[PDB]
Amino acid sequence: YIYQDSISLPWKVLLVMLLALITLATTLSNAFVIATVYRTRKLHTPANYLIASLAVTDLLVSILVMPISTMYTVTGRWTLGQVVCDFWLSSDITCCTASIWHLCVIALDRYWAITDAVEYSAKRTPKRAAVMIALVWVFSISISLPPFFWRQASECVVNTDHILYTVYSTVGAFYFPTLLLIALYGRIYVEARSRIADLEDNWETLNDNLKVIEKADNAAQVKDALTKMRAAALDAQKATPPKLEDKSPDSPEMKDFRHGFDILVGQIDDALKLANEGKVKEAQAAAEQLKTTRNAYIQKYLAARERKATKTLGIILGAFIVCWLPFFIISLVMPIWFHLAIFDFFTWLGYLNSLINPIIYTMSNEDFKQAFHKLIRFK
Ligand SMILES: CN1C[C@H](C(=O)N[C@]2(C)O[C@@]3(O)[C@@H]4CCCN4C(=O)[C@H](Cc4ccccc4)N3C2=O)C=C2c3cccc4[nH]cc(c34)C[C@H]21
Known part of the structure; x- marks a missing residue:
């Protein structure tokens, strides 16, 4: 049964238009963040490089995962074959895990900078930033690589046979990074409070x-x-x-x-x-x-007393939980309720986080804000 077969023609075409505009808005908003770091010499620092790599992951989600998903979400049937299905599911797991883990690597960098400024100043280098980014991607590909037990080859869904991997993937990709972020934000918030x-x-x-x-x-x-x-x-x-x-x-x-x-x-x-x-x-x-x-x-x-850096990290933390917590909660209770529409909604809610994050940075960070104002020729 496909619940999408009941959706009328006008609501189906509107749904395609809404999803296609989200995908496009994610591609351009992240393309702007990448170019702004690349073009501006003032922004050639390991901290902005982490922003630029987060924008690169969110761009791959918008190219490798979201367009090919819009049709599957609206129609409800897979028509691209088994091989394309294998790469699409894995690029969905790998890039989204890379997206989540970029957030705590940005937080780790901010935590060390506000908690250990002298010892960290000497260690905060572009080589250090690269090594941490590679680790995130190696860990990301390692999460999607085990569900290759498909010794059998209309439907395209990740292998749900092994409960032990299913929970390891959910913990390694979400629950471990959120607990780390809460702890990281807590220490950062308390540091800034005593510093002001x-x-x-x-x-x-x-x-x-x-x-x-x-x-x-x-x-x-x-x-x-x-x-x-x-x-x-x-x-x-x-x-x-x-x-x-x-x-x-x-x-x-x-x-x-x-x-x-x-x-x-x-x-x-x-x-x-x-x-x-x-x-x-x-x-x-x-x-x-x-x-x-x-x-x-x-x-x-x-201006300093307003702690813009912790305030904006709070908005990112908030935006991350409200986007991915419903998905990973349903992802764990699903093996053990409403229809498949709530799964489709919560996947896209996680996808939307790839668009929210670059708009939060360009509205909050004045370097990215002034770059945008230049782009649209606004003073
Ligand atoms: C957003 N992205 C979406 C993607 C996904 O749900 N893809 C499918 C193709 O879409 C479903 O939701 C559809 C929608 C309606 C019916 N569906 C299902 O019944 C099953 C549910 C399911 C969820 C999780 C695990 C197994 C099965 N779906 C699928 O397999 C997997 C993700 C993921 C799973 C595990 C670790 C992860 N790290 C990062 C991520 C991720 C990124 C994250």
Whole structure:
């Protein structure tokens, strides 16, 4: 029985048009993300390479799996033969597993960057990124390779004979990566929370000590509030969590919040020199410059407190669960309920995640956002 045989001609052609536009929108949205990393020299960093390889996996899903699926989902019958069926099922398992595992490799990279910044800076290289990507693909192909027990060769479905592999495939491909992502997001969320809580205190110490220099009575009072201000600025500079946007070291970092403390420290040192010279009135007058420099970084400070990197990783985590949790839940309860339409809906729900992810990055990451605005000639 095929439930699709009951669907009318107008609803069938509309369903083909909806599915074909999702497939096309996934291909172009991921093609944009790949080209943007490739074309922009500023984006040639291991972190953006992981975005670019996630976009490559999602592009293969849109070329090897989704077009050839639209017809099978709407008609409900396989007409391409056994050989094409073998490659289609395996490219569905391999690319979707690669898609899921790219997400935790991006999270692993963000976790190490926010949790172990000094030790990781030396290890975060494009060679490291390649080795991790190869491992993801080798693990992806290894998941789809065992159901080749088809010693027998209208219907095209993956081998459901061995319950032990069926659950290993579901765990290795989904349940293990989600538990890793929850743990990874948890540590990242808590890291950023304490990093902005420290940034808030160092910012307040900077503001209050800046008030003291103005209302100072002694030279020793001026000199002390300056060294305290000096220490808080460099502490605020380390407290500020990493941005969502990743740029290569060889790129001008103007109006950057972390740079504001560098020029500010330079000014605090210039003022302490006059204080050590004996020109305290001049050292006090240097606070008028410090006041304006601080005033120019308030907007960049208030921006840091919003933790865009963890916020957007939360939206990706959220988008990943809401897209794949129904599929892998039904995938486990199916051997042990409603019709085959809910399986077709939940497969496409997982497919949709290949489109949601590149639109989340290009709306959130300002490098990808400005690249898009350039593409459609919008200012
Ligand atoms: C989205 N993609 C879809 C794809 C799939 O369901 N393909 C078929 C061809 O479509 C069905 O859903 C259809 C729809 C209506 C009736 N159907 C079935 O009765 C069986 C159910 C089934 C699900 C899982 C395992 C065995 C059988 N279907 C199929 O075999 C397998 C996936 C998968 C399975 C196992 C590990 C995995 N890692 C990544 C993935 C993946 C990607 C992931």
